[PDB]
Amino acid sequence: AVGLG
Amino acid sequence: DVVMTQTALTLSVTIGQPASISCKSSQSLLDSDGKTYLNWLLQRPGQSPKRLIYLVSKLDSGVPDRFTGSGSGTDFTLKISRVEAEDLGVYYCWQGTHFPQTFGGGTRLEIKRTDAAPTVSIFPPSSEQLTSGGASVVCFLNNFYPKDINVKWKIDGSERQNGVLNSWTDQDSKDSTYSMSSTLTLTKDEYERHNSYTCEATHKTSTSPIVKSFNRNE
Amino acid sequence: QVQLQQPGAEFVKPGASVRMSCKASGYTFTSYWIAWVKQRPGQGLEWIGDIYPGSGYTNYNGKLKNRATLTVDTSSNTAYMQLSSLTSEDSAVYYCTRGGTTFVAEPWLAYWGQGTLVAVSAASTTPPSVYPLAPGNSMVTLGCLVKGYFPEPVTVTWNSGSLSSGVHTFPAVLQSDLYTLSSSVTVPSSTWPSETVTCNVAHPASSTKVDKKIVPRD
């Protein structure tokens, strides 16, 4: 998911 | 990137009746953590987009129960049980599962009504504009339905596209029609070399275009 | 409450750069991504890039070709977007929107700014020229064409607001660095020209007001 590390 | 296809570019709806729109993705939106990051947004005329649904089916704070999101994998749908006036606008799906994030093209909800032909009015350049060195010919196409329409400009029988400025209104609050303004701007030099000026209105309400014309020699 | 505040408009010349701001409030600024979304006048939404205010980590859309630069100022809770070498294809509305955190993606797009209109033009502040549209049936259609001004907005009323039914004011269109709009009004032939019809045009940016009485043409 975008923005997750 | 992930292509999001919104089906029904425009959906004509009726107040109190259901509506359904779909969003298809070129890849599965299921993330490795088990969740599916599919959001639906509504952009009302003149407003910022607003989120209605995240996580394919989860309603945002304050969003009425009439909205329902559903789907899995690549195929998703937004449904309204009974449409209200506050639901009209453009709906966008969005994905945050795959980088980069992508938006769908959008589905517009508009009010369905009976067909209405455009009222066409043409206007030669005003004398005030001619003293300034410009020459604009204006064609109004008012209170037609549905919204799709095409305007052709002819100068002494030949079509002109060069120098045409078009503008369209939002769906009318009261009678649900659409209106269009088309402006053909020339230089005074060019304008005084020709005689006949015509705007032609092509609309589904007729098989022959509506033709409004004037001769400069009059 | 969570709010993102954006300037209303920015005016920029071709080849120059613009800098837009998004002032955040109501939450921990450094914990949520900030994304920038572009919307051309009649088009859909496009992701331009995002920034994580905690570190200043940035992501960009490839289609800008390293012209966009995103920054944050943690001391003022403000996110910035800068765009270089602007052409007319960068004329659009740019929205601030708040993403998720580095741990949860669910809040993505939950809050939006009101958007900043960016108009690319070589023009400086220019007042409008107002041209009457008089006819070259039971109803008659009149209009007034508003050309050659910069920047937006101009407002149009008829008979100082007393005439509001049957009025179509079309959205302004930028072309060759200057804006053009028109407005039509339809009144009964019995009432014009025996009763006057005047369009009132106000252009706050140039501190200008124009009244144009529509008199029959000859």
Side-chain angles (χ1 to χ4, degrees), chain A, chain B, chain C residues 1-161 163-218:
Chain A
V2 296
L4 299 184
Chain B
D1 312 341
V2 175
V3 173
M4 310 281 285
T5 302
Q6 279 187 256
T7 247
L9 291 200
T10 319
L11 174 64
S12 305
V13 301
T14 292
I15 304 279
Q17 285 177 27
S20 158
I21 64 180
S22 92
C23 178
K24 295 181 201 162
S25 46
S26 66
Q27 285 174 39
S28 165
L29 296 187
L30 178 70
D31 210 28
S32 91
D33 63 343
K35 293 164 187 188
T36 305
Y37 295 93
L38 195 279
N39 297 359
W40 287 94
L41 309 110
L42 166 66
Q43 175 168 50
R44 284 178 61 60
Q47 314 269 57
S48 289
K50 187 185 121 187
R51 205 177 65 163
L52 304 182
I53 294 152
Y54 62 108
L55 267 203
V56 175
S57 59
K58 265 75 168 322
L59 261 51
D60 270 275
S61 148
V63 176
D65 52 280
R66 72 172 168 280
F67 289 96
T68 303
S70 81
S72 202
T74 60
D75 272 88
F76 306 89
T77 56
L78 168 54
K79 289 200 180 127
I80 307 165
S81 55
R82 296 159 231 87
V83 166
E84 319 279 357
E86 289 73 34
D87 305 333
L88 311 174
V90 183
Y91 287 76
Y92 294 97
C93 58
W94 171 93
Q95 75 91 17
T97 296
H98 298 287
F99 184 90
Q101 81 191 238
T102 43
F103 290 93
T107 290
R108 175 177 296 282
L109 260 68
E110 60 106 41
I111 293 293
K112 172 101 199 144
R113 59 148 290 149
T114 54
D115 290 346
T119 303
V120 191
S121 324
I122 188 176
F123 299 93
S126 77
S127 97
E128 287 101 324
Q129 189 188 17
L130 289 174
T131 69
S132 98
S136 295
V137 191
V138 175
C139 189
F140 287 134
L141 293 73
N142 283 349
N143 310 97
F144 59 85
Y145 187 87
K147 74 199 303 304
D148 273 345
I149 197 154
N150 291 284
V151 182
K152 194 143 283 195
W153 281 98
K154 277 170 173 192
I155 301 192
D156 290 322
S158 316
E159 164 169 9
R160 209 206 160 74
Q161 296 143 232
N162 236 23
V164 176
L165 183 144
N166 289 330
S167 190
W168 307 260
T169 57
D170 291 329
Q171 185 160 46
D172 187 87
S173 209
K174 309 313 193 56
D175 78 350
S176 277
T177 61
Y178 296 90
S179 282
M180 183 195 187
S181 178
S182 186
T183 300
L184 163 68
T185 296
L186 311 161
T187 66
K188 188 187 178 186
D189 190 15
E190 216 145 292
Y191 171 71
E192 310 273 23
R193 298 184 182 270
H194 305 279
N195 184 44
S196 205
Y197 293 82
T198 294
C199 57
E200 292 188 359
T202 292
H203 195 241
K204 140 193 210 307
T205 43
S206 151
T207 166
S208 309
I210 302 185
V211 176
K212 285 312 196 284
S213 212
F214 74 88
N215 287 329
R216 196 188 35 97
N217 283 175
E218 274 158 33
Chain C
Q1 171 61 309
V2 182
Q3 292 174 181
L4 307 163
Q5 176 223 318
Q6 301 182 257
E10 306 276 12
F11 319 118
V12 71
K13 309 194 144 19
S17 314
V18 65
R19 185 177 232 241
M20 311 181 288
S21 77
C22 175
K23 193 211 190 311
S25 65
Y27 69 96
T28 295
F29 176 59
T30 59
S31 293
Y32 292 80
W33 291 85
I34 293 283
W36 289 87
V37 175
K38 165 187 190 180
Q39 174 166 58
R40 298 268 285 163
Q43 306 300 103
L45 310 166
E46 179 178 36
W47 171 85
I48 273 205
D50 43 52
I51 184 161
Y52 183 61
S55 68
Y57 187 93
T58 61
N59 288 118
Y60 298 107
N61 191 316
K63 281 41 62 180
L64 291 162
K65 293 122 95 150
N66 320 93
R67 287 184 310 122
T69 297
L70 304 185
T71 44
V72 291
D73 176 24
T74 50
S75 307
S76 55
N77 284 10
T78 301
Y80 293 98
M81 183 161 106
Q82 180 162 348
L83 201 48
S84 80
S85 309
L86 295 138
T87 88
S88 63
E89 293 230 56
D90 303 305
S91 284
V93 172
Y94 294 86
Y95 290 101
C96 197
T97 185
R98 183 184 91 160
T101 77
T102 57
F103 305 97
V104 295
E106 274 92 330
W108 264 98
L109 310 181
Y111 298 89
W112 292 70
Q114 293 307 277
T116 301
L117 188 272
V118 168
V120 188
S121 158
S124 297
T125 294
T126 309
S129 319
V130 184
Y131 302 128
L133 306 167
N137 191 37
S138 211
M139 302 301 276
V140 65
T141 291
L142 314 169
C144 86
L145 170 69
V146 180
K147 267 185 71 65
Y149 69 91
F150 190 92
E152 274 275 90
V154 308
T155 60
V156 186
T157 62
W158 291 90
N159 289 352
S160 317
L163 183 43
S164 49
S165 266
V167 170
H168 291 304
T169 294
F170 299 86
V173 177
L174 184 64
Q175 199 167 302
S176 321
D177 305 281
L178 294 176
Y179 283 101
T180 283
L181 65 70
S182 45
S183 171
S184 70
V185 64
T186 296
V187 302
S189 35
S190 61
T191 72
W192 182 90
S194 55
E195 304 294 334
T196 67
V197 171
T198 302
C199 94
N200 329 100
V201 174
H203 187 224
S206 72
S207 297
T208 298
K209 287 178 184 292
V210 179
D211 288 338
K212 275 308 278 224
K213 187 172 144 177
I214 311 308
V215 300
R217 195 210 289 271
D218 195 303

mmCIF file of all heavy atoms in Angstrom, chain B residues 144-177:
data_model
loop_
_atom_site.group_PDB
_atom_site.id
_atom_site.type_symbol
_atom_site.label_atom_id
_atom_site.label_comp_id
_atom_site.label_asym_id
_atom_site.label_seq_id
_atom_site.Cartn_x
_atom_site.Cartn_y
_atom_site.Cartn_z
ATOM 1 N N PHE B 144 -30.991 23.072 -23.847
ATOM 2 C CA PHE B 144 -31.127 21.816 -24.561
ATOM 3 C C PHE B 144 -30.830 20.666 -23.607
ATOM 4 O O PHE B 144 -30.217 20.846 -22.551
ATOM 5 C CB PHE B 144 -30.197 21.756 -25.787
ATOM 6 C CG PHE B 144 -28.723 21.922 -25.464
ATOM 7 C CD1 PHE B 144 -27.950 20.839 -25.076
ATOM 8 C CD2 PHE B 144 -28.109 23.163 -25.579
ATOM 9 C CE1 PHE B 144 -26.589 20.995 -24.790
ATOM 10 C CE2 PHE B 144 -26.758 23.324 -25.295
ATOM 11 C CZ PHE B 144 -25.997 22.237 -24.900
ATOM 12 N N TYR B 145 -31.289 19.477 -23.998
ATOM 13 C CA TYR B 145 -31.077 18.220 -23.312
ATOM 14 C C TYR B 145 -31.176 17.129 -24.368
ATOM 15 O O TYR B 145 -32.062 17.201 -25.231
ATOM 16 C CB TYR B 145 -32.102 17.954 -22.200
ATOM 17 C CG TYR B 145 -31.728 16.728 -21.417
ATOM 18 C CD1 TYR B 145 -30.867 16.819 -20.329
ATOM 19 C CD2 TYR B 145 -32.176 15.470 -21.803
ATOM 20 C CE1 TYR B 145 -30.485 15.691 -19.626
ATOM 21 C CE2 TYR B 145 -31.800 14.339 -21.117
ATOM 22 C CZ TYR B 145 -30.954 14.453 -20.025
ATOM 23 O OH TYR B 145 -30.579 13.326 -19.335
ATOM 24 N N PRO B 146 -30.290 16.121 -24.347
ATOM 25 C CA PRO B 146 -29.188 15.943 -23.397
ATOM 26 C C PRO B 146 -27.994 16.833 -23.731
ATOM 27 O O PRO B 146 -28.069 17.656 -24.644
ATOM 28 C CB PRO B 146 -28.821 14.461 -23.558
ATOM 29 C CG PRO B 146 -29.149 14.151 -24.994
ATOM 30 C CD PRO B 146 -30.364 15.015 -25.325
ATOM 31 N N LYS B 147 -26.887 16.625 -23.020
ATOM 32 C CA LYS B 147 -25.830 17.623 -22.964
ATOM 33 C C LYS B 147 -24.913 17.602 -24.174
ATOM 34 O O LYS B 147 -24.218 18.591 -24.421
ATOM 35 C CB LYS B 147 -24.996 17.416 -21.701
ATOM 36 C CG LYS B 147 -24.078 16.207 -21.778
ATOM 37 C CD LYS B 147 -23.593 15.723 -20.398
ATOM 38 C CE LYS B 147 -22.881 16.822 -19.605
ATOM 39 N NZ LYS B 147 -21.732 17.418 -20.354
ATOM 40 N N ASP B 148 -24.880 16.512 -24.925
ATOM 41 C CA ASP B 148 -23.944 16.409 -26.033
ATOM 42 C C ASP B 148 -24.441 17.209 -27.226
ATOM 43 O O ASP B 148 -25.575 17.033 -27.680
ATOM 44 C CB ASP B 148 -23.723 14.944 -26.412
ATOM 45 C CG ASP B 148 -22.606 14.296 -25.592
ATOM 46 O OD1 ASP B 148 -21.830 15.036 -24.948
ATOM 47 O OD2 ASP B 148 -22.508 13.050 -25.574
ATOM 48 N N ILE B 149 -23.560 18.049 -27.763
ATOM 49 C CA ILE B 149 -23.914 18.968 -28.836
ATOM 50 C C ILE B 149 -22.631 19.332 -29.568
ATOM 51 O O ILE B 149 -21.541 19.308 -28.994
ATOM 52 C CB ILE B 149 -24.622 20.220 -28.256
ATOM 53 C CG1 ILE B 149 -25.369 21.007 -29.332
ATOM 54 C CG2 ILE B 149 -23.629 21.112 -27.526
ATOM 55 C CD1 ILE B 149 -26.534 21.797 -28.754
ATOM 56 N N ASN B 150 -22.764 19.732 -30.829
ATOM 57 C CA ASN B 150 -21.608 20.136 -31.609
ATOM 58 C C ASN B 150 -21.954 21.389 -32.397
ATOM 59 O O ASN B 150 -23.060 21.509 -32.936
ATOM 60 C CB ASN B 150 -21.159 19.006 -32.548
ATOM 61 C CG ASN B 150 -20.571 17.811 -31.789
ATOM 62 O OD1 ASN B 150 -19.430 17.859 -31.316
ATOM 63 N ND2 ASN B 150 -21.358 16.741 -31.661
ATOM 64 N N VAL B 151 -21.006 22.324 -32.461
ATOM 65 C CA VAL B 151 -21.195 23.580 -33.174
ATOM 66 C C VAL B 151 -20.184 23.645 -34.305
ATOM 67 O O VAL B 151 -18.983 23.459 -34.085
ATOM 68 C CB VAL B 151 -21.052 24.802 -32.253
ATOM 69 C CG1 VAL B 151 -21.314 26.079 -33.040
ATOM 70 C CG2 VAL B 151 -22.012 24.688 -31.091
ATOM 71 N N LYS B 152 -20.673 23.926 -35.504
ATOM 72 C CA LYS B 152 -19.849 24.140 -36.682
ATOM 73 C C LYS B 152 -19.975 25.600 -37.101
ATOM 74 O O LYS B 152 -21.088 26.126 -37.195
ATOM 75 C CB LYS B 152 -20.304 23.211 -37.815
ATOM 76 C CG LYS B 152 -19.346 23.089 -38.987
ATOM 77 C CD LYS B 152 -19.341 21.670 -39.536
ATOM 78 C CE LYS B 152 -18.530 20.752 -38.627
ATOM 79 N NZ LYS B 152 -18.182 19.440 -39.253
ATOM 80 N N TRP B 153 -18.839 26.253 -37.331
ATOM 81 C CA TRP B 153 -18.799 27.614 -37.848
ATOM 82 C C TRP B 153 -18.464 27.574 -39.330
ATOM 83 O O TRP B 153 -17.526 26.880 -39.738
ATOM 84 C CB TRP B 153 -17.762 28.464 -37.110
ATOM 85 C CG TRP B 153 -18.231 28.954 -35.779
ATOM 86 C CD1 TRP B 153 -17.952 28.405 -34.565
ATOM 87 C CD2 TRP B 153 -19.067 30.088 -35.525
ATOM 88 N NE1 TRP B 153 -18.558 29.126 -33.565
ATOM 89 C CE2 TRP B 153 -19.251 30.164 -34.126
ATOM 90 C CE3 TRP B 153 -19.680 31.047 -36.341
ATOM 91 C CZ2 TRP B 153 -20.024 31.159 -33.524
ATOM 92 C CZ3 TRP B 153 -20.448 32.033 -35.748
ATOM 93 C CH2 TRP B 153 -20.614 32.084 -34.350
ATOM 94 N N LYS B 154 -19.222 28.311 -40.133
ATOM 95 C CA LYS B 154 -18.959 28.409 -41.559
ATOM 96 C C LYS B 154 -18.795 29.872 -41.948
ATOM 97 O O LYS B 154 -19.538 30.739 -41.478
ATOM 98 C CB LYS B 154 -20.073 27.759 -42.372
ATOM 99 C CG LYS B 154 -19.944 26.245 -42.528
ATOM 100 C CD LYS B 154 -21.232 25.697 -43.127
ATOM 101 C CE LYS B 154 -21.146 24.222 -43.472
ATOM 102 N NZ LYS B 154 -22.313 23.822 -44.312
ATOM 103 N N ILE B 155 -17.788 30.144 -42.769
ATOM 104 C CA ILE B 155 -17.498 31.480 -43.268
ATOM 105 C C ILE B 155 -17.540 31.408 -44.787
ATOM 106 O O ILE B 155 -16.627 30.852 -45.411
ATOM 107 C CB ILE B 155 -16.137 31.994 -42.780
ATOM 108 C CG1 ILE B 155 -16.087 32.033 -41.254
ATOM 109 C CG2 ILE B 155 -15.859 33.380 -43.336
ATOM 110 C CD1 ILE B 155 -14.882 32.800 -40.717
ATOM 111 N N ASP B 156 -18.588 31.982 -45.384
ATOM 112 C CA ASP B 156 -18.805 31.924 -46.834
ATOM 113 C C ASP B 156 -18.803 30.477 -47.328
ATOM 114 O O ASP B 156 -18.203 30.145 -48.355
ATOM 115 C CB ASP B 156 -17.769 32.758 -47.596
ATOM 116 C CG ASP B 156 -17.945 34.253 -47.392
ATOM 117 O OD1 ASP B 156 -19.105 34.736 -47.332
ATOM 118 O OD2 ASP B 156 -16.905 34.947 -47.291
ATOM 119 N N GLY B 157 -19.450 29.597 -46.565
ATOM 120 C CA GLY B 157 -19.586 28.203 -46.935
ATOM 121 C C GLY B 157 -18.482 27.271 -46.468
ATOM 122 O O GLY B 157 -18.684 26.053 -46.490
ATOM 123 N N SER B 158 -17.330 27.788 -46.039
ATOM 124 C CA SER B 158 -16.215 26.953 -45.598
ATOM 125 C C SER B 158 -16.173 26.862 -44.078
ATOM 126 O O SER B 158 -16.294 27.873 -43.377
ATOM 127 C CB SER B 158 -14.870 27.489 -46.104
ATOM 128 O OG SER B 158 -14.929 27.873 -47.461
ATOM 129 N N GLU B 159 -15.960 25.651 -43.576
ATOM 130 C CA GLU B 159 -15.897 25.449 -42.138
ATOM 131 C C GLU B 159 -14.643 26.100 -41.565
ATOM 132 O O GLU B 159 -13.567 26.054 -42.166
ATOM 133 C CB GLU B 159 -15.917 23.953 -41.805
ATOM 134 C CG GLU B 159 -15.459 23.646 -40.382
ATOM 135 C CD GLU B 159 -15.722 22.212 -39.949
ATOM 136 O OE1 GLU B 159 -16.113 21.377 -40.801
ATOM 137 O OE2 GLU B 159 -15.539 21.930 -38.741
ATOM 138 N N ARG B 160 -14.797 26.739 -40.409
ATOM 139 C CA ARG B 160 -13.690 27.310 -39.659
ATOM 140 C C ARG B 160 -13.692 26.755 -38.240
ATOM 141 O O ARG B 160 -14.738 26.709 -37.590
ATOM 142 C CB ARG B 160 -13.781 28.840 -39.639
ATOM 143 C CG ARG B 160 -12.417 29.515 -39.538
ATOM 144 C CD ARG B 160 -12.520 30.873 -38.896
ATOM 145 N NE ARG B 160 -11.240 31.330 -38.368
ATOM 146 C CZ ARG B 160 -10.232 31.770 -39.113
ATOM 147 N NH1 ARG B 160 -10.346 31.816 -40.438
ATOM 148 N NH2 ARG B 160 -9.110 32.165 -38.526
ATOM 149 N N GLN B 161 -12.532 26.297 -37.785
ATOM 150 C CA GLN B 161 -12.315 25.842 -36.424
ATOM 151 C C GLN B 161 -11.351 26.765 -35.709
ATOM 152 O O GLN B 161 -11.318 26.793 -34.491
ATOM 153 C CB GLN B 161 -11.752 24.415 -36.432
ATOM 154 C CG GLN B 161 -12.729 23.424 -37.014
ATOM 155 C CD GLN B 161 -12.067 22.354 -37.842
ATOM 156 O OE1 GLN B 161 -12.451 22.117 -38.991
ATOM 157 N NE2 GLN B 161 -11.055 21.706 -37.273
ATOM 158 N N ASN B 162 -10.537 27.461 -36.469
ATOM 159 C CA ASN B 162 -9.431 28.306 -36.063
ATOM 160 C C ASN B 162 -9.995 29.566 -35.402
ATOM 161 O O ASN B 162 -10.589 30.423 -36.065
ATOM 162 C CB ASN B 162 -8.679 28.586 -37.383
ATOM 163 C CG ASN B 162 -7.215 28.184 -37.304
ATOM 164 O OD1 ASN B 162 -6.877 27.291 -36.430
ATOM 165 N ND2 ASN B 162 -6.449 28.533 -38.300
ATOM 166 N N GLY B 163 -9.781 29.696 -34.105
ATOM 167 C CA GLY B 163 -10.205 30.879 -33.388
ATOM 168 C C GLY B 163 -11.520 30.732 -32.632
ATOM 169 O O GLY B 163 -12.112 31.753 -32.258
ATOM 170 N N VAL B 164 -11.989 29.501 -32.391
ATOM 171 C CA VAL B 164 -13.283 29.236 -31.765
ATOM 172 C C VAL B 164 -13.071 29.007 -30.272
ATOM 173 O O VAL B 164 -12.190 28.238 -29.872
ATOM 174 C CB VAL B 164 -13.976 28.022 -32.413
ATOM 175 C CG1 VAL B 164 -15.272 27.713 -31.691
ATOM 176 C CG2 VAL B 164 -14.238 28.255 -33.894
ATOM 177 N N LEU B 165 -13.871 29.679 -29.447
ATOM 178 C CA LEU B 165 -13.817 29.536 -27.996
ATOM 179 C C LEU B 165 -15.189 29.106 -27.489
ATOM 180 O O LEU B 165 -16.166 29.856 -27.615
ATOM 181 C CB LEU B 165 -13.384 30.851 -27.341
ATOM 182 C CG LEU B 165 -13.200 30.914 -25.823
ATOM 183 C CD1 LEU B 165 -12.042 31.839 -25.504
ATOM 184 C CD2 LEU B 165 -14.483 31.378 -25.122
ATOM 185 N N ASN B 166 -15.249 27.931 -26.870
ATOM 186 C CA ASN B 166 -16.503 27.343 -26.427
ATOM 187 C C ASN B 166 -16.581 27.296 -24.908
ATOM 188 O O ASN B 166 -15.574 27.117 -24.215
ATOM 189 C CB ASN B 166 -16.673 25.928 -26.976
ATOM 190 C CG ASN B 166 -16.945 25.910 -28.464
ATOM 191 O OD1 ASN B 166 -17.536 26.842 -29.010
ATOM 192 N ND2 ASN B 166 -16.528 24.840 -29.129
ATOM 193 N N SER B 167 -17.800 27.394 -24.396
ATOM 194 C CA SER B 167 -18.015 27.317 -22.965
ATOM 195 C C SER B 167 -19.400 26.737 -22.719
ATOM 196 O O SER B 167 -20.351 27.062 -23.432
ATOM 197 C CB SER B 167 -17.875 28.711 -22.343
ATOM 198 O OG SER B 167 -17.841 28.670 -20.935
ATOM 199 N N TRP B 168 -19.510 25.917 -21.671
ATOM 200 C CA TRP B 168 -20.720 25.178 -21.342
ATOM 201 C C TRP B 168 -21.088 25.449 -19.892
ATOM 202 O O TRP B 168 -20.203 25.564 -19.039
ATOM 203 C CB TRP B 168 -20.524 23.662 -21.521
ATOM 204 C CG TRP B 168 -20.003 23.244 -22.862
ATOM 205 C CD1 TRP B 168 -20.734 22.755 -23.903
ATOM 206 C CD2 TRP B 168 -18.636 23.252 -23.298
ATOM 207 N NE1 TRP B 168 -19.908 22.469 -24.972
ATOM 208 C CE2 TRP B 168 -18.615 22.765 -24.623
ATOM 209 C CE3 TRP B 168 -17.430 23.628 -22.700
ATOM 210 C CZ2 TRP B 168 -17.433 22.646 -25.356
ATOM 211 C CZ3 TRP B 168 -16.258 23.507 -23.427
ATOM 212 C CH2 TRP B 168 -16.269 23.022 -24.740
ATOM 213 N N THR B 169 -22.388 25.537 -19.610
ATOM 214 C CA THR B 169 -22.870 25.683 -18.238
ATOM 215 C C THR B 169 -23.096 24.323 -17.569
ATOM 216 O O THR B 169 -23.235 23.286 -18.225
ATOM 217 C CB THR B 169 -24.184 26.464 -18.186
ATOM 218 O OG1 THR B 169 -25.165 25.806 -19.005
ATOM 219 C CG2 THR B 169 -23.985 27.914 -18.650
ATOM 220 N N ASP B 170 -23.146 24.345 -16.239
ATOM 221 C CA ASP B 170 -23.596 23.182 -15.487
ATOM 222 C C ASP B 170 -25.082 22.931 -15.741
ATOM 223 O O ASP B 170 -25.824 23.822 -16.162
ATOM 224 C CB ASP B 170 -23.380 23.391 -13.986
ATOM 225 C CG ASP B 170 -21.918 23.392 -13.590
ATOM 226 O OD1 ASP B 170 -21.107 22.699 -14.244
ATOM 227 O OD2 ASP B 170 -21.586 24.094 -12.611
ATOM 228 N N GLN B 171 -25.531 21.720 -15.407
ATOM 229 C CA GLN B 171 -26.943 21.401 -15.563
ATOM 230 C C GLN B 171 -27.795 22.392 -14.770
ATOM 231 O O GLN B 171 -27.526 22.668 -13.596
ATOM 232 C CB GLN B 171 -27.227 19.968 -15.100
ATOM 233 C CG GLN B 171 -28.674 19.525 -15.358
ATOM 234 C CD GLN B 171 -28.849 18.016 -15.363
ATOM 235 O OE1 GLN B 171 -28.341 17.317 -14.488
ATOM 236 N NE2 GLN B 171 -29.585 17.510 -16.338
ATOM 237 N N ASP B 172 -28.832 22.916 -15.413
ATOM 238 C CA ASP B 172 -29.639 23.945 -14.775
ATOM 239 C C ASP B 172 -30.344 23.421 -13.526
ATOM 240 O O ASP B 172 -30.879 22.309 -13.505
ATOM 241 C CB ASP B 172 -30.668 24.493 -15.749
ATOM 242 C CG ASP B 172 -31.421 25.678 -15.179
ATOM 243 O OD1 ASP B 172 -30.933 26.823 -15.319
ATOM 244 O OD2 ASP B 172 -32.497 25.459 -14.582
ATOM 245 N N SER B 173 -30.339 24.255 -12.482
ATOM 246 C CA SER B 173 -30.975 23.919 -11.210
ATOM 247 C C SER B 173 -32.456 23.594 -11.376
ATOM 248 O O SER B 173 -32.980 22.702 -10.698
ATOM 249 C CB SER B 173 -30.811 25.091 -10.237
ATOM 250 O OG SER B 173 -30.788 24.656 -8.892
ATOM 251 N N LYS B 174 -33.160 24.345 -12.221
ATOM 252 C CA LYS B 174 -34.618 24.329 -12.233
ATOM 253 C C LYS B 174 -35.218 23.481 -13.350
ATOM 254 O O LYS B 174 -36.204 22.776 -13.122
ATOM 255 C CB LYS B 174 -35.153 25.763 -12.320
ATOM 256 C CG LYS B 174 -34.559 26.711 -11.274
ATOM 257 C CD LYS B 174 -34.577 26.095 -9.869
ATOM 258 C CE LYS B 174 -34.282 27.131 -8.787
ATOM 259 N NZ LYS B 174 -35.222 28.295 -8.831
ATOM 260 N N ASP B 175 -34.666 23.522 -14.560
ATOM 261 C CA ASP B 175 -35.257 22.786 -15.665
ATOM 262 C C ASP B 175 -34.346 21.699 -16.198
ATOM 263 O O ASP B 175 -34.736 20.992 -17.135
ATOM 264 C CB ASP B 175 -35.677 23.753 -16.790
ATOM 265 C CG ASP B 175 -34.511 24.230 -17.672
ATOM 266 O OD1 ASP B 175 -33.322 24.003 -17.347
ATOM 267 O OD2 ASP B 175 -34.803 24.882 -18.700
ATOM 268 N N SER B 176 -33.143 21.551 -15.643
ATOM 269 C CA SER B 176 -32.293 20.395 -15.882
ATOM 270 C C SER B 176 -31.695 20.419 -17.282
ATOM 271 O O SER B 176 -31.329 19.373 -17.817
ATOM 272 C CB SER B 176 -33.038 19.083 -15.630
ATOM 273 O OG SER B 176 -33.022 18.769 -14.256
ATOM 274 N N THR B 177 -31.673 21.580 -17.932
ATOM 275 C CA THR B 177 -31.129 21.687 -19.271
ATOM 276 C C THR B 177 -29.666 22.100 -19.204
ATOM 277 O O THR B 177 -29.113 22.385 -18.135
ATOM 278 C CB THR B 177 -31.903 22.701 -20.101
ATOM 279 O OG1 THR B 177 -31.808 23.991 -19.472
ATOM 280 C CG2 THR B 177 -33.364 22.284 -20.254
#
